[PDB]
Amino acid sequence: GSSGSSGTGEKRYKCNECGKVFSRNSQLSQHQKIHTGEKPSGPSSG
């Protein structure tokens, strides 16, 4: 037992991108997309 007697309930989904945590996955998945970074074209004419 590794100081984990009780807990099974609120899976602390950690962001593999930054490394943060969220109470619910529905709040993390929507964040894991923030790293995508969709910046416009600069030096190129897009």
Contacts with Zn ion by CB under 5 A lie at 15, 17-18
**Closer residue to Zn ion, CB minimum distance, 1 or 19:** 19
**Closer residue to Zn ion, CB minimum distance, 17 or 39:** 17
Residue 11 beta carbon to Zn ion: minimum distance, rounded to whole angstroms: 16
Query: Helices marked H in 1-46 — which ranges?
Result: 25-32
Residue 13 beta carbon to Zn ion: minimum distance, rounded to whole angstroms: 10
Do the beta carbons of residue 28 and residue 17 sit within 8 Å?
no
